Design a binder for this molecule. Sequence first.
Ligand SMILES: [Ca+2]
Ligand SMILES: [Ca+2]
Length: 279
Amino acid sequence: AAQTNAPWGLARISSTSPGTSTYYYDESAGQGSCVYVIDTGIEASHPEFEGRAQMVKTYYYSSRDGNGHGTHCAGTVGSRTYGVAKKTQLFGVKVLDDNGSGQYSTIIAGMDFVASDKNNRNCPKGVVASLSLGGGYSSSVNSAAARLQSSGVMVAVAAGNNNADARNYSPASEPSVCTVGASDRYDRRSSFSNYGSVLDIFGPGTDILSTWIGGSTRSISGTSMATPHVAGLAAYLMTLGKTTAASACRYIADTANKGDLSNIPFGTVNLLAYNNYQA
Ligand SMILES: [Ca+2]
Ligand SMILES: [Ca+2]
């Protein structure tokens, strides 16, 4: 398959060079895979999801996404125009309120929930979880993200938008999960991107066009927008039988784009997510 005039983030994942505008992906598009989107929830009624998005849990009182953050990142995972795993099943767990805030107890309970409701769903190819939140260091949310990864889920988390070492932030500094940095249009490190040895992979995170609440589309930039690129890539890769949730992150790093990024500090990886699809 091939999508013309794609968002720069989609085309970059299917490329060895920046600047391309066509996104090349296998026709499977990650069908049979599930990606839990742990954010502000998802607006399931968006025409870009096509019944593939679903609100399965809210830790507030309404499954609405009255923020737009969670609908944007879920769009990058597997919507029609802006998703990398265009046929995946999107499950929306709402740990962030309509302001983008969220207590660690709520974020932890959301990860503990995904690991259980995973067994109540039909995901033959496997399960993915994209946690594009980020707070200060916590031993317990690092522990909760590891429990999600150990339970059989590919866990992609945001590196943080602090321009510092991601070792001070959670769940980013959890070694078991996949910490995703953000890159911009020209294969530079995003000016907000966290770095450090904790990061496992980079993704398009600057000016990422995706869906938005109210049936709209808009671009926002953050490592929280680069994370869904790796979530959908892991989903799209596990559908191909190329990798397993337990090692999707390491497989993406093995088959990434080596040394293409600039502004990478010393000790941080220089890998850009690459689906390696060749038609
Ligand atoms: Ca998001
Ligand atoms: Ca490297």
